[PDB]
A paper describes a structure:
The interaction of the central mitotic checkpoint component [name] with the mitotic kinetochore protein Blinkin is required for the kinetochore localization and function of [name] in the mitotic spindle assembly checkpoint, the regulatory mechanism of the cell cycle that ensures the even distribution of chromosomes during the transition from metaphase to anaphase. Sequence comparison of [name] and BUBR1 shows that these proteins share a common architecture: a conserved N-terminal region, a central nonconserved region that contains the binding region for other mitotic checkpoint components such as BUB3, and a C-terminal serine/threonine kinase domain. The N-terminal region mediates the binding of Hs-[name] to the mitotic kinetochore protein Blinkin (a protein also commonly referred to as AF15q14); the interaction is essential for the kinetochore localization of this protein and its function in cell cycle arrest induced by SAC activation (Kiyomitsu et al., 2007). The structure shows that a divergent triple tandem arrangement of the TPR motif constitutes a suitable structural framework for the physical linkage of [name] to interacting partners.
The crystal structure of the N-terminal region of Sc-[name](29-230) from budding yeast was solved at 1.74 Å resolution, and contains two molecules of [name] in the asymmetric unit, related by a noncrystallographic two-fold axis, forming a homodimer. The two protomers are associated primarily by hydrogen bonds and van der Waals interactions and involve clusters of conserved residues E52-P57, M98-K109, and R175-R182. Salt bridges between the oxygen atom of residue D53 of one protomer and the nitrogen atoms (NH1, NH2) of R179 and R182 of the other, as well as between D55 of one protomer and K109, R175, and R179 of the other, contribute further to the stability of the homodimer. The structure of the Sc-[name](29-230) protomer consists of ten α helices (H1–H10) that contribute three major features: a single α helix (H1), a tandem repeat of three units of the tetratricopeptide (TPR) motif (H2-H7), and a C-terminal region encompassing three α helices (H8-H10). Each TPR unit (TPR1, TPR2, and TPR3, numbered from the N terminal) comprises two antiparallel α helices, arranged as a helix-turn-helix hairpin. The uniform arrangement of neighboring α helices gives rise to the formation of a right-handed superhelical structure with a continuous concave surface on one side and a contrasting convex surface on the other. The amphipathic helix 8, which encompasses residues Y177 to M194, has the features of a “capping helix. Helices H9 and H10 lie parallel to the long axis of the TPR core, establishing extensive polar contacts with TPR helices H3, H4, H5, H6, and H7. The analysis of the crystal structure of Sc-[name](29-230) strongly suggests that the impaired interaction between these Hs-[name] mutants and Blinkin is due to the disruption of stabilizing interactions among α helices of the TPR units.
Numbering used by the authors: 31 to 199, 204 to 229
The structure:
């Protein structure tokens, strides 16, 4: 009874993606509605199908919306990228970093504090300690919003740096610059396009 209703809802959303997206003012909203439904209702009943459908839907969303310049600094869009990285790329630093680099190259999220906070966190966890600091400072120099929160994120990070006895001896900036040079789209994007 529940499973059947859930399956009809899945097909209803899939049809809407085919029929309705093209004419929408806010096509991102339809993807968001569907992803929220999958991650709550659908995955609670069928975790293995739900995982696959969530991953595919998120990839479709990113691919469909990515070349629409109007969405470049939409915080809702940014969050989908970061959810994707966290859910699906967490065991893969290179693909995670490549995703952030691809976004950076396309100007996705580059005016939003969250982008720099999350990208810095990735580098921090990977022990690129001073590159992670420079990335936060880069966000501030690009006038990213919310600005004050970014400044507090940087302050808290400097506190973590002191707890590990870390200071410079500008190579960290040049090291970050080297890390930021765009090379290739992440594999999940390339695989989607070729499939």
């Amino acid at each position: 009874e529940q499973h059947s209703q859930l399956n009809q809802t899945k097909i209803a959303y899939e049809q809407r993606l085919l029929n309705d997206l093209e004419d929408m003012d806010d096509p991102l909203d339809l993807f968001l509605d569907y992803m929220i439904w999958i991650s709550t209702s659908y995955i609670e009943v069928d975790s293995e199908s739900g995982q696959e459908v969530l991953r595919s839907t998120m990839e479709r969303c990113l691919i469909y919306i990515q070349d629409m310049e109007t969405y470049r600094n939409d915080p809702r869009f940014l969050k989908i990228w970061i959810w994707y990285i966290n859910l699906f790329l967490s065991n893969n630093f290179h693909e995670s970093e490549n995703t952030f680099k691809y976004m950076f190259n396309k100007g996705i999220g580059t005016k939003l504090s969250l982008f720099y906070e999350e990208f810095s966190k990735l580098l921090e966890n990977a022990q690129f300690f001073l590159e992670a600091k420079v990335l936060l400072e880069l966000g501030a120099e690009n006038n990213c919003r919310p600005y004050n929160r970014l400044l507090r994120s940087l302050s808290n990070y400097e506190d973590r740096l002191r707890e590990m006895n870390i200071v410079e001896n500008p190579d960290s900036r040049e090291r970050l610059k080297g890390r930021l040079i765009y090379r290739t789209a992440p594999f999940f994007i390339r695989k989607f396009l070729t499939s």
